[PDB]
Prior knowledge:
Two copies of one chain form a homodimer.
Chain A: H1 8-16, H2 20-31, H3 35-48, E1 56-62, H4 68-81, E2 86-91, E3 103-108, H5 112-125, E4 130-136, H6 141-146, E5 151-156, H7 163-168, E6 171-174, H8 182-198, E7 209-212, H9 221-237, H10 240-267, H11 269-283, H12 289-301
Parallel strand pairs in A: 1-4, 1-5, 2-3, 2-4, 5-6, 6-7
Bound molecules: chloride ion (8 copies) and sodium ion (2 copies).
One chloride ion (CL) binds next to α11 of chain B.
InterPro entries (chains A, B): GTPase_ArgK, P-loop_NTPase
GO cellular component, one term (chains A, B): cytoplasm
Protein name (chains A, B): GTPase ArgK
Amino acid sequence: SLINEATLAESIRRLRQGERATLAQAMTLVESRHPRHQALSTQLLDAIMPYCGNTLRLGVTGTPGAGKSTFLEAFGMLLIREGLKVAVIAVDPSNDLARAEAAFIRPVPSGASQRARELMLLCEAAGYDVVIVETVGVGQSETEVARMVDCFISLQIAQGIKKGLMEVADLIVINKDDGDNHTNVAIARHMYESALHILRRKYDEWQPRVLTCSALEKRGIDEIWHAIIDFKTALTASGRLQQVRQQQSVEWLRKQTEEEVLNHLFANEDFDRYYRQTLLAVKNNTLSPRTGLRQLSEFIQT
Amino acid sequence: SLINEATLAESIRRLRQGERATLAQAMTLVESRHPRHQALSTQLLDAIMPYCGNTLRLGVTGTPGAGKSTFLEAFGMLLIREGLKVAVIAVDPSNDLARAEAAFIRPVPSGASQRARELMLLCEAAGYDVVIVETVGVGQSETEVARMVDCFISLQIAQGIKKGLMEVADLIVINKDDGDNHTNVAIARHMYESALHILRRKYDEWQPRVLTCSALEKRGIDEIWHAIIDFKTALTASGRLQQVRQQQSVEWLRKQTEEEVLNHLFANEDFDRYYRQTLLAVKNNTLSPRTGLRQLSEFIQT
Ligand SMILES: [Cl-]
Ligand SMILES: [Cl-]
Ligand SMILES: [Cl-]
Ligand SMILES: [Cl-]
Ligand SMILES: [Cl-]
Ligand SMILES: [Cl-]
Ligand SMILES: [Cl-]
Ligand SMILES: [Cl-]
Ligand code: NA
Ligand code: NA
């Protein structure tokens, strides 16, 4: 069926009934750069807001070689066996699940952060029980994913532990606990656990947990889902999950508003030039930082 | 002697010769809110920039009960015995050293960040060998101090370890390793060390060290100074210290420039109102985040 201004309400109806063709169509619309599609997309997203917010939002990162694909397939299939509908938003770095009718998989091209969030909203409005946003754990991708999900899960394989990961990890999982590397897996699991037991809790309500699994042998997956449920229980008992979700949305709005204002300034060719000359003046000991700041402020005011 | 526009150059001369009365006078001038003093202060700070930058800058935080005062006295007196001139900038939270002629102690009232930096510059121009900026370790004060010093030292006494501290600690010191609490001190020292050995290094060149001392018994202090020297050796071998200092100055300029622009916007009574109404519209599911952002952008442009 066509999606357009006249049919928007019926299209939303179809979407909320969980019709997969309409979900895919709506996502494609949201991804179009055609100015007309951008305005209709805006109408759609405004319209669906009341239908969002009753979906468990999970983030999953995996380092290269961590077995993210096999884990996601096993985990996804477990959720479907539990009778749940699961969507996977596969974000680009800066199988059996594919065949499941109760699943839905969509890639997000390398911003992509706003895009991932909007696609997640569509999945929520479509009645998915669990939405998983996943990407490679590299650079700061853990903290970026963490900011849009209820529960953040990092996959690791058996330099020290990344501090940014410690900041955001709710669960750490060591995949490929199979064959002959049990000891290597146990040592890695122990190391993450030492860090997560000694550092202050991200949430007062939750000691982060470190688990192991073998996706390809189907062991440990049930236990990971159970830990996620335990997390949900702990955070919802105090009303902290709702608070987290509100804080994430406020922080996104605030950060994007600030960043647009700042990007416009630092993009300006005249300001960029004056800024760089000011920096060089300070570096070369001709101006104090105080004076550097004042003249930047005056340039901005004028 | 008077400090004024006519005498500025001779006053700078006196300052560079290490005359303590002129240093105190210059600091008082920098702290005056009298508009005339603010302009002369600007001239002074510009003028001294070429004389700065050959001083070891240390940051020291202590938690309540960590023995910061006794440690600073013992440490300061050690440096003076080594024939060094040491200045202490005592920053407000958001003895024998006092009697030493080769020392200089100045408080900074509860911004205070810009003020601490400017007073540090005066000490550098005055020929101090070591300048120590110190404050209570509470909230985010560790990261704030860390951003203006060559080497950051945190005092702890025998909830888990603060992640912000792990981000910035170059050395951790457990004071009051005396009397009957050796075991309690050893356990605390071990805990910090576990975290600092397992987490990725802040600097590739340096594994953070955790030491113990008894300031009041004068034991362990020599070893702490030696560790600081080891830090300086490690970072200067690769040219990393110079890079750190440059990055700190650029980051301060950048952050203060951004924060002034943003504070003016979010201070604006009309924008604050529209921003809060937009936030509430999103919270109440009447607008998508996309639309929230767009209309904030339009409000700003207009
Ligand atoms: Cl079309
Ligand atoms: Cl804790
Ligand atoms: Cl909740
Ligand atoms: Cl300039
Ligand atoms: Cl006067
Ligand atoms: Cl490392
Ligand atoms: Cl260096
Ligand atoms: Cl509004
Ligand atoms: Na949210
Ligand atoms: Na600097």
